[PDB]
Amino acid sequence: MGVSVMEAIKEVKLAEEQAVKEIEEAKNRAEQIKAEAIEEAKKLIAC
Numbered sequence: 001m002g003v004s005v006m007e008a009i010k011e012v013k014l015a016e017e018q019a020v021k022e023i024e025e026a027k028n029r030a031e032q033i034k035a036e037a038i039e040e041a042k043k044l045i046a047c
Contacts, residue, residue, distance in 0.1 A: 006015060 007013070
């Protein structure tokens with residue numbers, strides 16, 4: 001198709017941001033469940 005200069009044109013490595021954002025969600029979804037345990041503290045929290 002074309003040329004692989006994603007790094008040549010810019011050494012920002014923005015592409016990496018896609019690998020961290022794609023894997024990060026994996027962990028976040030894990031807290032969605034554990035959060036249930038914290039949802040209780042909401043009813044009564046020590047301010």
